[PDB]
Design a binder for this molecule. Structure first.
Ligand SMILES: Nc1nc(=O)c2nc(CNc3ccc(C(=O)N[C@@H](CCC(=O)O)C(=O)O)cc3)cnc2[nH]1
Ligand SMILES: [Ca+2]
Ligand SMILES: [Cl-]
Ligand SMILES: [Cl-]
Ligand SMILES: [Cl-]
Length: 159
C-alpha cells in the first residue's frame, strides 16, 4: 500500500519560496512516528530541504537528473521508486508537490497535519475530494511553548 504524509497550512499550502514559517517539533515527531522503518519516497527539492538522509528509513529520491549523494537511492520513474521499495506493507510518499501529484491516484491512505497558518504558498498539496476519503483518526493541538501554531493530525483512508 502507498501512503502520503504531508503538512498542510490553510488552502493546502505545503511549501514556500523559503523555509516554512513555523516551528512544529510535535509535527516532526508525528512524521517520524509514521515513517520510521518504512521506505520513504521524495523529490529532489524535499531532499535538499531535509539536508541529509532521514534516519532509520530507506530514502528514495525520485529525479530525472543523476544523483549527488551516495547515502540514498536515486530513481528516475515512479515505477522505479516503487520497485526500489521491495516487498513492504506500506510505502510512504513524503513530497513535495509534484511527487504527491504523481502518487495520489495510487495512494490508499493520507496522513495529514493541518496547520492553522495563513501563508502564501509556492506549492500545494493536491486538491483531494474529502468526500472520497474516510477520516479514521483526528487529534487537535493548540500552539504551546515548543510549537508555534495550532495543528491537527488526521489519518484518512480511501473510501
Ligand atoms: N507531517 C509532516 N510534517 C512535515 O513537515 C513534513 N515535511 C515533509 C518534508 N520535510 C521534512 C523536513 C524535515 C524532516 C525531519 O527533520 N524529520 C525528522 C524529525 C525532526 C527532528 O528530529 O528534529 C525525522 O527523523 O523524521 C522531515 C521532513 C514531508 N512530509 C511532512 N509531513
Ligand atoms: Ca471517522
Ligand atoms: Cl506523534
Ligand atoms: Cl520535491
Ligand atoms: Cl470522514
Amino acid at each position: 500500500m502507498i501512503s502520503l504524509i504531508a503538512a498542510l497550512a490553510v488552502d493546502r499550502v505545503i511549501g514556500m519560496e523559503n523555509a516554512m514559517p513555523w516551528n512544529l517539533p510535535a509535527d516532526l515527531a508525528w512524521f517520524k512516528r509514521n515513517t520510521l522503518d518504512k521506505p520513504v519516497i521524495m523529490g529532489r527539492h524535499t531532499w535538499e530541504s531535509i539536508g541529509r538522509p532521514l534516519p532509520g528509513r530507506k530514502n528514495i529520491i525520485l529525479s530525472s537528473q543523476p544523483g549527488t549523494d551516495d547515502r540514498v537511492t536515486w530513481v528516475k520513474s515512479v515505477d522505479e521508486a516503487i520497485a526500489a521499495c521491495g516487498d513492504v506493507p506500506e510505502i510512504m510518499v513524503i513530497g513535495g508537490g509534484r511527487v504527491y501529484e504523481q502518487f495520489l491516484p495510487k495512494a490508499q491512505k493520507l496522513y495529514l497535519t493541518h496547520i492553522d497558518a495563513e501563508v502564501e504558498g509556492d506549492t500545494h498539496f493536491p486538491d483531494y475530494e474529502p468526500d472520497d476519503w474516510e477520516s479514521v483518526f483526528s487529534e487537535f493541538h493548540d500552539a504551546d511553548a515548543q510549537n508555534s501554531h495550532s495543528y491537527c493530525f488526521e489519518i484518512l483512508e480511501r473510501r
